[PDB]
């Protein structure tokens, strides 16, 4: 097994400002795919155990 990690797009990209959160929603589903991919890693790491 490996180390199970999870990455949020909100705290990483944005510096907690209202301008960055409004321009993040125009990009849409780019962070929808990245959160489901790191979730699907962490399910399969428990199946290896």
């Amino acid at each position: 097994s490996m180390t199970k990690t999870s990455v949020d797009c909100t705290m990483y990209i944005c510096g907690d400002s209202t301008e960055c959160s409004n321009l993040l929603l125009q990009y849409g589903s780019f962070c929808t795919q990245l959160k489901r991919a790191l979730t699907g890693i962490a399910v399969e790491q428990d199946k290896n155990t």
Binding site: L23, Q26, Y27, G28, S29, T32, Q33
Partner: protein, 48 residues
């Protein structure tokens, strides 16, 4: 003949009542369907 015919009858009763044993093949339908449904929603967002 009592043991082998009753053991294969429990396989037929389990697949009819419970569909959860085939769910590894149902994810192959589901991972292909969620990849196509996410890709067609890229045209609605404005990309800046």
């Amino acid at each position: 003949a009592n043991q082998f015919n009753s053991a294969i009858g429990k396989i037929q009763d389990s697949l009819s009542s419970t569909a959860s044993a085939l769910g590894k093949l149902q994810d192959v339908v589901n991972h292909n369907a969620q990849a196509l449904n996410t890709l067609v929603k890229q045209l609605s967002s404005k990309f800046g």
